[PDB]
Design a binder for these strands. Sequence first.
RNA 1: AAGUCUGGGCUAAGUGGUAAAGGAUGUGGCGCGGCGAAGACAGCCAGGAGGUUGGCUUAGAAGCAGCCAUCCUUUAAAGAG
RNA 2: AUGUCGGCUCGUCGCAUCCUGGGGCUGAAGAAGGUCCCAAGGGUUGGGCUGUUCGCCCAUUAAAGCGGCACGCGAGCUGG
Lengths: 140, 36, 141, 176, 159
Amino acid sequence: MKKVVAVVKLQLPAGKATPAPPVGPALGQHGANIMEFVKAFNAATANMGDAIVPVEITIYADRSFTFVTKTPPASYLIRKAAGLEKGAHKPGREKVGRITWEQVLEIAKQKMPDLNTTDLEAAARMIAGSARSMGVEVVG
Amino acid sequence: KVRASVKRICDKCKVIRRHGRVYVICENPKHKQRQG
Amino acid sequence: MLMPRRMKYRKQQRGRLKGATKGGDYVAFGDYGLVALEPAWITAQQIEAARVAMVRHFRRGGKIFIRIFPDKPYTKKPLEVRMGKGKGNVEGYVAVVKPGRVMFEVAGVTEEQAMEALRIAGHKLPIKTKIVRRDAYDEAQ
Amino acid sequence: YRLKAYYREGEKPSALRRAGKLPGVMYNRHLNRKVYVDLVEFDKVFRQASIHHVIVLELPDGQSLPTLVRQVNLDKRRRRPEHVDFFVLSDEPVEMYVPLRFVGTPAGVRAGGVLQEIHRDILVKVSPRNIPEFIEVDVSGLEIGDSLHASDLKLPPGVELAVSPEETIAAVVPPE
Amino acid sequence: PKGVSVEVAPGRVKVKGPKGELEVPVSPEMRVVVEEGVVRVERPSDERRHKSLHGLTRTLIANAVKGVSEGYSKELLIKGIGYRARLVGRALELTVGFSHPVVVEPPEGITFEVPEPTRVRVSGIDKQKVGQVAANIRAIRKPSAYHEKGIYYAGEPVR
RNA sequence: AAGUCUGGGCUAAGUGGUAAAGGAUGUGGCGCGGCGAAGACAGCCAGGAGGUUGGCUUAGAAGCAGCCAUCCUUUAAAGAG
RNA sequence: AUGUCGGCUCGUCGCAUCCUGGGGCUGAAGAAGGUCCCAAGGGUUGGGCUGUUCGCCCAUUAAAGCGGCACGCGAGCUGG
Ligand SMILES: [Mg+2]
Ligand SMILES: [Mg+2]
Ligand SMILES: [Mg+2]
Ligand SMILES: [Mg+2]
Ligand SMILES: [Mg+2]
Ligand SMILES: [Mg+2]
Ligand SMILES: [Mg+2]
Ligand SMILES: [Mg+2]
Ligand SMILES: [Mg+2]
Ligand SMILES: [Mg+2]
Ligand SMILES: [Mg+2]
Ligand SMILES: [Mg+2]
Ligand SMILES: [Mg+2]
Ligand SMILES: [Mg+2]
Ligand SMILES: [Zn+2]
C-alpha cells in the first residue's frame, strides 16, 4: 500500500515455492523470473520461519520486482492458536475451537507492525472479530 | 425493448416520455425500452 | 395445493360476495402483511403459488403467515357436456376474500425484504392488494 | 400526551367525519360523554401513543381529563379509525397492557429462527401514578424448540399479573 | 453584454456582433427588451408551461449572444485506415470506405475546416445549425463493427 | 324548439365519444414526513483506507458465482461492499 | 324449405406479414441468422397420393403467409 505500477500481491508458505499453481504464472505473466524469486524468496522464508508470508511483489519492465514481506494473515495465527485445520464453513454460531482474551493479544503483538494502530486493545479487537470470521469464539 | 411494463434496469437509465409514449434510455442499448 | 380433510358436504352453493370482510382486517401476527382491496375467490393454486413466490424470494429467512383458507369446494361441468343432469363435480378449492382482509403477513425480516416478498406475491393474485405494517389496532391497553 | 377534545350533543357522526372529526367517548363508573377529537391530531398522537400510554383531554371548558384508550374501531377496508373511545382515568386498580421490549437477540442465529413476539405486551393491575413504560424479556437462553411465557417477566412494585399464567408471551421458530 | 444589439420585435430579437445578425423566434410571452446594459427575462405565475418557456428563451438568447462572440467549435475525427477527409475550399469533402467517393454541401452561414485530413471541425455563427451539420457529417459514416474506424466527435469509442 | 346565459373549478387526450392486470419525473388540489444558511438537492474538486485475498467450496471465488458471518481497525468518511 | 363437403370460376377485405421496403436489439466480425417494431403496394409456382379439407412427399422459389366474406361463390359449373 505505497506506490503502484503493475504490482501483484500474493501469499506463500515455508520454503516450499515454485509450483505454477500458487505462484508460477502468478508473476511470470507480468514478465518475470520464477528463478530470481523461487530462491530469492527462500532466502528470507528459511530465516524467519516456515508458515505463510504475505509477499506482495511489484513489477517493472526489467522483469524486476520488490517482494515486500509481511506477517502471516491474521487468519493463520488464530487457527493454530486453537488447533484448527480449516476455517469453519459457516461462522457466527459454531465455534469449532476457541481462543482467550490473551491468546488474541499475543498475536496482536505479532501483527501490530503491519496494522496502523499502536494500541494493543485496538489491534486485539480487529482480531477478536477475526474469530466471528471463522467460527472460533473468544474466551472472556 | 417493447412492452406493457417499461421499468428501469440500471442506475443509468432515464424514464424519458416523448410523444405520449413512455420510452426508457440507458447507456447500453440492451435497456432501450418503449411502451406498446 | 391446500384443501380441507373433511367437511360434511362434498359440494356447496356458490353464495355471494357482499363487500367488507367479516374479520381479519388487522394484522395480528407478523410485522408486515398483505391486504385485499377487491372481493374474489382465491384458489388453492394461487395461495400456494404465492406462498412459495414469497419464500423463494427471501430463501431461508423469516416466517410467513397465511391467513385465508380455501374450504369452499369449487365445481365445474366437464367440457362439451350440456346444461342440467346434476351439479358439476369438484375442480379444486377456493377461499372467499372480501375487501380489507389481511390475507398474508411476513415476520422476522427487513422492511426491505417485506415490501418486496409481498409485491411479488401480489402479482400472483387475481385481485388488487396493498401492503401494511403493524399500527393502530393492537391487542392491548 | 395531550389532545384537544370536544363535545357532541347529537350531531350526525357521518357529518362529523366528513369534516375531519373522528368521534369517540370517555366513560367510567362516573362520567360518560360524547366527544369528537380531531382525527389527524389524534392519529399523529395515538400513532406513537397507543393504548399503552395515558392521554390528557384538553376540553373546550378547562377540565383536563386523564385518558387510557379502550378500543379504536376500524373501517375494515381502508384500515382507518371510526370510533376512538378512551377510558377516563381514576387511581383505582386500572387493568392495562404493559409493552414488552425483549432485547438480547436469543439463540436462533446462523440456525436462523424467528422471534415470534407472540403477545407484544400484557395486561395487569396497577394505579395511574404507576405507568410502567415497559418490561423485560431478554431471552437469549431460549432457543428454537423452547419458549418462555407465563411467569417469566419481572413485576416491579405496583404491577401484578392478570393471567394464570401460561400465555406463551413469545417463542422462536424455524426459517424457510 | 458586449457589442450586441438586442432587437425586440414581436418574437424577433435579432442580435448583431463582430460576425453577423441572429434573429431568435422567441415566444411572444412575458416580453423582455434590451432593457438595461444587459438582458432580463421575466414570467407570470409558476405555470409549468411558463416555467419551461422562461429558460427555453433565457439560454436560447444567451447562445444568440455568443452568436458573434464566436460559437464555431464542433470538431470531428475520422480514425481508421483510408479514412481522413480533407478540405476543398470553403467546402468539405469526405472520403471513407464507400467504393464510390462522396462530397458534402454548402451550408449557407457555416464554414468548414480541415487542419489535417484526420481532423475536421466546423465554423459556426448560429448553433443548432452547427450542431446539425455535425451529426450530418458525423452520420456519413457510423463508428464501430464491434470496433475500429468511422467518423467521430470528441466523445469516446465503444468496445 | 329553447341560454353560444352566469360564477367557481378540473381536463389537452378529441379524453369526452365505452375495456383489464400492469406500467409512467402527465397535470391539479389537500396531506404526512426528511433534510436546510451549526449551510442542505443536484453539482464540480478530494478522499473513498486497514486486519483481509473475512471463513468454506472451487482451476480460480481477492467487496463483487453460491454458502456463512457481518465483528473490529485508523478516521472528515470507507459496506467484510 | 335459408341446398349441405371438396374442387372449378370470379374475386375482394383484414393484418395477427410468408416474400420484397424501412428500422432497434443481438450471445451483430463479415456473409448468414435470431427477436421485436413499422409497413399489405404488389407478389405468394408446378406436380405424386387421397373425395378429401388437412397433411406427407417430389422439383423449385424472393416467398411458396394466416384468416373474414352464409367455414364467400350449386337462379355460375361440377357432384368425387
Ligand atoms: Mg395440515
Ligand atoms: Mg352494501
Ligand atoms: Mg459485433
Ligand atoms: Mg334554435
Ligand atoms: Mg381507458
Ligand atoms: Mg325459396
Ligand atoms: Mg403490424
Ligand atoms: Mg450481417
Ligand atoms: Mg392437379
Ligand atoms: Mg387420384
Ligand atoms: Mg382469401
Ligand atoms: Mg360454404
Ligand atoms: Mg355420388
Ligand atoms: Mg353420376
Ligand atoms: Zn438502464
